[PDB]
Every structure is written in structure tokens, then in C-alpha cells.
């Protein structure tokens, strides 16, 4: 609940800054808004690729760290050291 709520708020914010303006050059609009043009399943899938260090996801560092801590706690509970 908390993770997806903060993710949704930050995604709305990122949307706002994405379509503020590109007066310098507007050729990058397609790549900048392909995120918001992808359907929700792929949206969450690519928002959730901060595992490992590929780091192509637009997820911010604090939101990444929250799940990185929750996953370690869950693995400790599951008994995977």
C-alpha cells in the first residue's frame, strides 16, 4: 500500500515535469513519454527494475531503498541467508 502510493505520487510528479515544456527541443518527447504510453503492467514492471545494478528504471533512490530493505527483511523471514 505505502510503496505503490508513493510510487503513484512520484509518477504523477514526474509526469508534470515531463510535460511542462521542451521549448529547447521537442524531438525527445516520444522517448520521455513512452513511459506514460506503456500499459500499466509494463509500467510497474519497468518501475520495478532497480534490482541488481542495471539502473535504467526511473525509480528514485529513496523508493528503491525502501523496497531494497523490505526484500531483505522478507528473505530473512523466509530463511534465505
Amino acid at each position: 500500500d505505502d510503496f505503490v502510493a508513493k510510487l503513484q505520487d512520484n509518477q504523477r510528479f514526474r509526469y508534470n515535469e515531463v510535460m511542462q515544456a521542451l521549448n529547447m527541443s521537442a524531438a525527445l518527447t516520444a522517448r520521455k513519454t513512452k513511459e506514460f504510453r506503456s500499459p500499466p503492467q509494463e509500467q510497474i514492471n519497468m518501475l520495478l527494475n532497480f534490482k541488481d545494478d542495471k539502473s535504467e528504471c526511473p525509480c528514485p533512490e529513496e523508493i528503491r531503498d525502501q523496497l531494497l530493505d523490505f526484500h531483505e527483511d522478507l528473505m530473512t523471514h523466509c530463511g534465505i541467508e
Binding site: 510510487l7 503513484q8 506514460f36 504510453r37 500499459p39 500499466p40 509500467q43 510497474i44
Partner: peptide
């Protein structure tokens, strides 16, 4: 164009669906 804009981004979806 219009098709992908008329697709609501993840933030518009109700929170339980996002969960």
C-alpha cells in the same frame, strides 16, 4: 497518439488495482 494518451497512466488507476 490519441490511443496511448487515452490510456490512463498508473497514477490515475485506483490504489487497489495498483497494489
Amino acid at each position: 497518439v490519441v490511443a496511448c494518451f487515452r490510456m490512463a497512466p498508473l497514477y490515475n488507476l485506483p490504489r487497489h488495482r495498483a497494489v
